[model samples]
Target chain A: MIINNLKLIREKKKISQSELAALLEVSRQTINGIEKNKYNPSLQLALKIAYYLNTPLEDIFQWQPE
Target chain B: MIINNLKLIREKKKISQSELAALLEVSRQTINGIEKNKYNPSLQLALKIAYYLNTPLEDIFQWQPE
Candidate 1:
């Protein structure tokens, strides 16, 4: 269940993967495969990426013990 | 971001909800939420789903213009 973990929370919110894939319109390899966890995002793009990274949504997803 | 979107496919497969839930070992609420389309599963879960359904990844999810 562990995958890309949001690339250290987008490098601690420095924000670049093509500016968060142009604010989640998608592309830039889908935010670089969702920060290299290799992609997941769908729950309305994970609540629009937790409302543009303000955080929450379980701090960019967890549930890892699979 | 689009959400859930797995219900119909599961129906087509003829698996009961509780049975499927046991198969995945999560609570019923989780599956219910996913079918509702706003609780995106992690990528590992996604691949597991797609593999279980024997379908392509692109089929379960689609991009919607925001």
Candidate 2:
């Protein structure tokens, strides 16, 4: 499974979820879902999010396998 | 959409498709698909590939919106 610290970083930046969505050219719902781990973003969207938030992908994202 | 240079990097690592699949614990067909752009991988798989190939995700992957 893949989990992330987007919620933490997004709050640190004081950026609203909807604004993040706007930056990614996606819907706020998508951001919400991603932050809440309701769904996974495509690689493109995920990479774009890390860039906009100025975080390394490894820091923002984690993968757990069993 | 996302495109990647996994093939180029994977080759530089001198890894076979089946071995890449083993590293990622996936099927060789999936590696082939990723190399040939038959489909995009999930964020988790993409990250794993980047780490195994000793490349940054940004260098391996590119995003384009049309």
Candidate 3:
């Protein structure tokens, strides 16, 4: 569903994946995977990411029906 | 960790677990598990659920750090 803007927001916030991972208490690979759309994150993690980025969930994620 | 309002919202919306499951294209057990806090939903499913319930994700799922 490639619906997340994690990478763009993270970069805009001047945070690296490793730093974001640490803040979210998740693995760097998890952040990488999420940015790359390798897998969808859990709702908890997604919310945490939005909080960290200071962005609305809808702004960070958009879903297209298939 | 047990932070979801799926059951409440579903009940309020007059929707059954089976019906919600069908709407979300997930198994009834999956819907039951979500309501019972058996597992965290993927972000995609969570978003779909929030859309279906006309609620924000945070309103439906809360995370208590442990």
Candidate 4:
């Protein structure tokens, strides 16, 4: 996935990595890992994350695909 | 996620599990597994499925959490 913007999404948000991690019940490292891995998380967390990032779900969805 | 409507979504659509799988490049059993597992895919496919089902992204998000 092309999560190039999720980083910017977090950069503009008022929360920190750990803070968002806690909010999502995941770890900061987990968040960092996702960003670095181009994302492979479940939709449960993925959609939750898009909501947290204030981006449209399909926008995030658009990131995947070869 | 609930994905309760996802099955219904496909039930009425002009495709089968494998057909949808072909659309997503995933497996047919993968689709059934996600449904049986109450959903556990990625935002990429999740939102894609939602769009296919004509369901809202946030509506799918509500199925998760607690």
Give the per-residue lDDT digits (tens) of candidate 2, residues B1-66: 567667777777786788767888888887778767756766777878777766777666765771
lDDT of 2 by residue, A1-66 (tens): 667667777788787888867888888787877878767776777888887777766666766662
lDDT of prediction 1: 0.61
What order do candidates take by lDDT, descending? 2, 3, 4, 1
Candidate 1 — which pairs collide? A4-A37, A42-B2, A44-B1, A44-B2, A45-B1, B3-B37, B4-B37
Q: List the residue pairs that clash in candidate 2.
A: none
In angstroms, how far off is A36's CA in candidate 2? Answer: 2.6
Per-residue C-alpha lDDT of model 1 across residues B1-65, encoded as one tens digit per residue: 35355666667676566765666666767876777744566655655556556644444554455
The alpha-carbon root-mean-square deviation between model 2 and the true structure, to one decimal in Å, is 2.3
By summed lDDT, the worst window of 10 consecutive residues in model 1 chain A runs over: A56-65
The sequence of per-residue lDDT tens digits that candidate 1 reaches over residues A7-30 is: 677778776766766787778687
- DockQ (CA atoms), all models: 0.17, 0.60, 0.49, 0.49
**Tens-digit per-residue lDDT, A1-66, candidate 4:** 545345556776655767767777788787767766744655567666676766765554465663
Residue pairs that clash (backbone atoms under 3 angstroms), model 3: none
Candidate 3 TM-score on chain B: 0.76
Q: lDDT tens string, model 4, B5-35?
A: 4555567565578876777777888886766
Q: For every candidate, what is the interface RMSD in angstroms? A: 6.0, 2.1, 2.5, 3.4
List runs of model 1 lying over 4 Å from the truth: A5-16, A23-40, A43-65, B1-3
| Cα shift from native, residue B66, model 2 (Å) | 5.8
Superposition error at A16 for model 2 (Å): 1.3
Q: Where does candidate 4 stray beyond 4 Å?
A: A2-5, A58-62, B1-5, B12-15, B58-62
Which lDDT value does model 1 have at B27? 71
